[PDB]
XYZ file of C-alpha atoms in Angstrom:
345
model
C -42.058 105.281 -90.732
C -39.384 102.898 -91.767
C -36.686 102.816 -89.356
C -33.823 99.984 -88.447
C -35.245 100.280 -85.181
C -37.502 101.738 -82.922
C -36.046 104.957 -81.218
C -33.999 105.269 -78.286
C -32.452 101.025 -78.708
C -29.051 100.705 -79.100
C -27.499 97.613 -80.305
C -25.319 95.315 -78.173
C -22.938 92.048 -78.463
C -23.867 89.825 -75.182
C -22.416 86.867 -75.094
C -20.909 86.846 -78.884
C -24.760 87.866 -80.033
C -26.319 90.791 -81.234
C -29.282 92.355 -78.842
C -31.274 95.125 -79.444
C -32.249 97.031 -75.834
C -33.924 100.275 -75.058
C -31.960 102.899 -73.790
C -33.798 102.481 -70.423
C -32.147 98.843 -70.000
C -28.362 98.984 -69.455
C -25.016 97.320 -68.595
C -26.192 93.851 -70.196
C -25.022 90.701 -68.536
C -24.927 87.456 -70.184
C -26.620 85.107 -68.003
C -27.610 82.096 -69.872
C -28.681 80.592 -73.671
C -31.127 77.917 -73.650
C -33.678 76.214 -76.768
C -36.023 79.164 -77.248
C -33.594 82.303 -76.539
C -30.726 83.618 -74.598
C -30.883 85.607 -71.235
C -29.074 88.831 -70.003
C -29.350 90.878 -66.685
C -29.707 94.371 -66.965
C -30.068 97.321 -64.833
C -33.285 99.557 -65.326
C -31.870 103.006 -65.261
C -35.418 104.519 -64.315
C -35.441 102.718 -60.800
C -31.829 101.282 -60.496
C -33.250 97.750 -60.403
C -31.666 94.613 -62.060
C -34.198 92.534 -64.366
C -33.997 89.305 -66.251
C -34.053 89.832 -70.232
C -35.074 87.210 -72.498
C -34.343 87.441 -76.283
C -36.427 85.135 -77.717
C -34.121 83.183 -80.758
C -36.003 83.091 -84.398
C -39.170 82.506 -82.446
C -41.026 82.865 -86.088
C -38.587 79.696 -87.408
C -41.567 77.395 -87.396
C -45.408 77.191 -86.309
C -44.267 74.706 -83.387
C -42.213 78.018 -82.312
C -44.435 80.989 -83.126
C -47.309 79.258 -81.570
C -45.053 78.556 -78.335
C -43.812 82.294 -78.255
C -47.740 83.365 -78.272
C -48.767 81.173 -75.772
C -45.649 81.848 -73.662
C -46.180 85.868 -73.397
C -49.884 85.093 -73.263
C -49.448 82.669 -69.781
C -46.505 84.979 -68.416
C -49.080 87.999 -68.927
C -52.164 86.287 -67.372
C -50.307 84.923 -64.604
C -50.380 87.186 -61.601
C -48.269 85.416 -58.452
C -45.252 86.206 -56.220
C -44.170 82.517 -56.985
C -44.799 82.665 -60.304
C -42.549 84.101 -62.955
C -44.068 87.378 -64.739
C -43.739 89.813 -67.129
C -42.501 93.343 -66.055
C -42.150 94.402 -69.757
C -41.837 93.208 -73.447
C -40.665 95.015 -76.350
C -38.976 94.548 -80.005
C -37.176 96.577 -81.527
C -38.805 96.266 -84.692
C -40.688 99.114 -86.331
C -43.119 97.388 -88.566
C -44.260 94.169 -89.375
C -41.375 93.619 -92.196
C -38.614 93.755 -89.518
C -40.727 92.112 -86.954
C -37.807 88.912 -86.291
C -37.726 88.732 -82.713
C -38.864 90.054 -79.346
C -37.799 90.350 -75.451
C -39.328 89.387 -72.751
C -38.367 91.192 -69.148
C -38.749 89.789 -66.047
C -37.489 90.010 -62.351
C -34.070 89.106 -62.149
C -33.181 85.950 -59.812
C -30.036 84.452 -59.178
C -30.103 80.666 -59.369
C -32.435 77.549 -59.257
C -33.204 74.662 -57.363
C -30.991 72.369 -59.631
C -28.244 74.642 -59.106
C -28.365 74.301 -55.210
C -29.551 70.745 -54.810
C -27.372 67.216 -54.013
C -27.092 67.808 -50.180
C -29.621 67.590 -47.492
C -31.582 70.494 -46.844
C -32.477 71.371 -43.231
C -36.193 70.904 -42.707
C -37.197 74.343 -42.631
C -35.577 75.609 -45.796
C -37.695 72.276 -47.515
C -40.823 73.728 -45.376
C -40.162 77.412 -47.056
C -39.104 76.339 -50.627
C -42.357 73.464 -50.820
C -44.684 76.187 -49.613
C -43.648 78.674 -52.236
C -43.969 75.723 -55.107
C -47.402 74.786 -53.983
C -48.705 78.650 -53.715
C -47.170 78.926 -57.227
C -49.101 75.859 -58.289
C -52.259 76.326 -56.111
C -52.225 79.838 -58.136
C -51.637 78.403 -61.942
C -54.106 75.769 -61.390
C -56.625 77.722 -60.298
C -56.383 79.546 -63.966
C -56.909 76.124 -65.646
C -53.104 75.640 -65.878
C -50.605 72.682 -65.349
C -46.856 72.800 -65.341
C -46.409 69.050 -66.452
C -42.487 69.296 -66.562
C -42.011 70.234 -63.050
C -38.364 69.964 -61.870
C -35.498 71.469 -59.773
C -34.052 73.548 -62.967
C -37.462 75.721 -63.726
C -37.463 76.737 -59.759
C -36.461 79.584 -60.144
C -34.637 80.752 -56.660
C -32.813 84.173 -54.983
C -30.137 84.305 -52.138
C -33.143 84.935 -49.510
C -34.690 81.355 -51.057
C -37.507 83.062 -52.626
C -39.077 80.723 -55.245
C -40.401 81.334 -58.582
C -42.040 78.525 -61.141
C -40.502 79.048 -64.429
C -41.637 77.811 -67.792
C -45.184 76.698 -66.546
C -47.875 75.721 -69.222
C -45.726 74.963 -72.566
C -45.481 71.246 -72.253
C -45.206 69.027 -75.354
C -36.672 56.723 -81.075
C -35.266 53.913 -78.936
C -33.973 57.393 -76.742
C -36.097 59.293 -73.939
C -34.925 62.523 -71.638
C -34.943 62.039 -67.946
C -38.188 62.405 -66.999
C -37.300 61.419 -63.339
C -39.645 64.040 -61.754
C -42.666 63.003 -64.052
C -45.868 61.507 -62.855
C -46.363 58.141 -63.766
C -49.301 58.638 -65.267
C -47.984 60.590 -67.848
C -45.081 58.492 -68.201
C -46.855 55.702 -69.312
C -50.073 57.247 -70.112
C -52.301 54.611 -68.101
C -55.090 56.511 -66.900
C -55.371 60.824 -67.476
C -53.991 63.478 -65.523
C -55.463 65.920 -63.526
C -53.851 68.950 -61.956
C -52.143 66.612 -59.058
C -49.941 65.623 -62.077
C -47.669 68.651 -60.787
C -47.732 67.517 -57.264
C -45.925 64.386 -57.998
C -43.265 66.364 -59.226
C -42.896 68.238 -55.922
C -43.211 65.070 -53.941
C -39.857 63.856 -56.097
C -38.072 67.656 -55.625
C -39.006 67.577 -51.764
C -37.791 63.868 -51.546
C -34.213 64.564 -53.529
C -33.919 67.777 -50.885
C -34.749 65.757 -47.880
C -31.685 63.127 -49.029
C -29.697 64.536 -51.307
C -30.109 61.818 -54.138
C -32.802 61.941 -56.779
C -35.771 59.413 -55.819
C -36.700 57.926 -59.213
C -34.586 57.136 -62.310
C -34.405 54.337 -64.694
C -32.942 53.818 -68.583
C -36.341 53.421 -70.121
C -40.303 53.298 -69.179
C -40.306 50.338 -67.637
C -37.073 50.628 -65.569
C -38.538 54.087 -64.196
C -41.839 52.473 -63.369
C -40.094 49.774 -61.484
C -38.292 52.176 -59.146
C -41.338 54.100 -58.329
C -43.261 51.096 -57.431
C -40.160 50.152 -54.798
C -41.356 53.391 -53.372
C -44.858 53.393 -54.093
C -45.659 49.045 -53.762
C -47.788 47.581 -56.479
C -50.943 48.941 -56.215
C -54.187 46.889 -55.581
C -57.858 46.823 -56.671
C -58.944 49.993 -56.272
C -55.963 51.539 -58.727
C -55.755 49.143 -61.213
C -59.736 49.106 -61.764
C -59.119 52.844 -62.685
C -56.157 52.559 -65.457
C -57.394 52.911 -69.680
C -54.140 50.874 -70.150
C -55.650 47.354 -70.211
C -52.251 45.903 -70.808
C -50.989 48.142 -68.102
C -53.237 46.765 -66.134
C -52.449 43.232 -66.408
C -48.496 43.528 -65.944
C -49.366 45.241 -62.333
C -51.974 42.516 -61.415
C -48.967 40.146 -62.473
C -45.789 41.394 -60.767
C -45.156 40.426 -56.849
C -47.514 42.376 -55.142
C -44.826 43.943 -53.167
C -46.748 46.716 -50.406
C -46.189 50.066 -50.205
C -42.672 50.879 -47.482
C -43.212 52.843 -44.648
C -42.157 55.854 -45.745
C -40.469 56.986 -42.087
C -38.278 53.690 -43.017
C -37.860 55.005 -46.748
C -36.727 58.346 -44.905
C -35.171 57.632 -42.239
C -34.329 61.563 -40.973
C -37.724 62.809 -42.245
C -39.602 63.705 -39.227
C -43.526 62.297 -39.418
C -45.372 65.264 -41.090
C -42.410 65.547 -43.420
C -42.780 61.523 -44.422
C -46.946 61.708 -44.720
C -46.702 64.797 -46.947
C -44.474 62.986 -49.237
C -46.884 59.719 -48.677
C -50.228 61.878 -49.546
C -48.077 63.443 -52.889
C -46.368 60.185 -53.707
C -49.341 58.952 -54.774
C -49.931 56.808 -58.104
C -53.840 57.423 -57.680
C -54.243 60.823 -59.340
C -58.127 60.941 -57.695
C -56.397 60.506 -54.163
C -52.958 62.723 -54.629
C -53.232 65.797 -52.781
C -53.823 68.864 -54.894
C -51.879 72.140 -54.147
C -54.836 73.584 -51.814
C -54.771 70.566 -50.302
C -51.001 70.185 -49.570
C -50.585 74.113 -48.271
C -52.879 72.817 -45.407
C -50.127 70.354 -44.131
C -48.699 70.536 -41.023
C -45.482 70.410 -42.963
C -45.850 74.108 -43.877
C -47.551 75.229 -40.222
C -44.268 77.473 -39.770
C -44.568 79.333 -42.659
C -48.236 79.243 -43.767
C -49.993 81.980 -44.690
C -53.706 81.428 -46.037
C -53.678 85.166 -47.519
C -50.729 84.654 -49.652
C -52.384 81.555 -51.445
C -54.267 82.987 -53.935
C -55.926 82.222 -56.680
C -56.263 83.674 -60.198
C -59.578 85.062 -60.741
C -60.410 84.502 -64.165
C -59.365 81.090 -66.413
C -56.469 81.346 -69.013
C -58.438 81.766 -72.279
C -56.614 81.520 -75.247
C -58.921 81.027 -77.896
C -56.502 80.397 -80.392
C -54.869 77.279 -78.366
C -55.751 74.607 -80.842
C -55.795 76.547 -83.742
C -53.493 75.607 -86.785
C -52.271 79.052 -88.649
C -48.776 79.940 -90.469
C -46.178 81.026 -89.100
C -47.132 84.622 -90.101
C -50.369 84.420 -88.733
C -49.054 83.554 -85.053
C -45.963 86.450 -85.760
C -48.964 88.541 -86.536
C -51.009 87.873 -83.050
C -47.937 88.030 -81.325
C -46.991 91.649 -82.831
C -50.319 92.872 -81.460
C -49.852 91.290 -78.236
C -46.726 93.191 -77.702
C -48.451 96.820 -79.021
C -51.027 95.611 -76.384
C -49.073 95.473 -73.650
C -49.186 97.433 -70.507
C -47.454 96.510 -67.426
């Protein structure tokens, strides 16, 4: 029947916005508001628990958005990992398609993230525990035929006890560029294709940045950023260069000193030995050679804290057979309706 909204929500102002919450969700908490949505803690009156709610914003605005709210609930729902973020419930308000606007996502509830706690030196074994739960995480989402690609200390998602979750996973898309300082190179300047390991890159720069406190690679523009990573990386040789698409790519390597590759116990001085041929096997501009997450949670690095039952994999691929399809925007607010009368924790 028509309704303004389903039964038992109430409405809400958090943070100077309007939210629409079941009666089960209470004491909302303006947390954060970010490109997509906003985010609120609540308490779950049924179990006494504090979750994370997301409200996504006009998610129906465009098909770049309503295709990116689909595939979102569709990887959060598929995704089943301690170190990955996941869904513990999603609802709307709405009562029928006609005031079908917006949804909410609800997830576990965690207090900060790795950009939030980074810029010192972290002891060794809080590196050890927070790598190990990003590679599980990975090792996990790969497995289902799923990359991050944006990897970085802000979408670690991280609690008091250190416990890690991946956040935002699998949604990756002027004279002007973002930082892009935890990007692979290969990516960057799109010189050969990626492969999963394009993620482990991106760890190798988060453990680096923990292990001294400074971020490893910057730079203004492409070129700049590529020129810092080869001061870590050296200019690579034959066997590399043979492998790049980028034939002018190619040729701007083969014609720069041919500076080697630092010791990396001398480019981290305090890293102890497993610590610095970890970060050697991910810093890696060979994406054929780079470890993969399997291969990294074998590492002595993580011998304190490794756990071969807890590194999972998903059992069946991500399959989203609409991926590459081009529909309106009512089309994808019509799959994602369904998917949210679908759900079931």
């Amino acid at each position: 029947m028509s309704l303004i909204r389903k039964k038992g929500f109430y409405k809400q102002d958090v943070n100077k916005t309007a939210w629409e919450l079941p009666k089960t969700y209470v004491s909302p908490t303006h947390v954060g508001s970010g490109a997509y949505g906003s985010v609120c803690s609540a308490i779950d009156k049924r179990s006494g628990e504090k979750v994370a709610i997301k409200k996504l914003s006009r998610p129906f605005q465009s098909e770049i958005f309503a295709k990116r709210a689909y595939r979102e609930l569709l990887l959060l729902k598929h995704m089943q990992h301690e170190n990955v973020i996941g869904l513990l419930d999603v609802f709307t308000p709405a009562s029928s398609l006609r005031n079908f606007y917006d949804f909410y996502l609800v997830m576990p509830f965690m207090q900060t993230d790795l950009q939030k706690i980074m810029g010192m030196e972290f002891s060794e074994e809080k590196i050890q525990y927070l790598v190990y739960q990003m590679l599980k995480g990975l090792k996990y989402i790969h497995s289902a035929g799923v990359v991050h690609r944006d990897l970085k200390p802000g979408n670690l998602a991280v609690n008091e006890d250190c416990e890690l979750k991946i956040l935002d996973f699998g949604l990756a898309r002027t004279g002007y560029v973002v930082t892009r300082w935890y990007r692979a190179p290969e990516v960057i300047l799109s010189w050969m294709h990626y492969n999963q390991t394009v993620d482990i890159w991106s760890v190798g720069c988060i453990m680096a940045e923990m292990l001294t406190g400074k971020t490893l690679f910057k730079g203004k523009d492409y070129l700049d950023q590529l020129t810092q990573i080869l001061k870590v990386t050296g200019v690579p040789g034959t066997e590399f260069v043979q492998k790049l698409n980028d034939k002018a790519a190619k040729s701007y390597i083969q014609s720069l000193p041919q500076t080697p590759r630092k010791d990396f116990t001398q480019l981290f001085p305090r890293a102890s030995p497993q610590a610095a041929d970890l970060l050697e096997k991910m810093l890696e501009l060979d994406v054929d050679k780079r470890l993969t997450a399997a291969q990294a949670l074998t590492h002595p690095f993580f011998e304190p804290f490794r756990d071969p039952e807890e590194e999972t994999e998903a059992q069946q691929p991500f399959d989203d057979s609409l991926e590459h399809e081009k529909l309106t925007v009512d089309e994808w607010k019509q799959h994602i309706y369904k998917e949210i009368v679908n759900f079931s924790p």
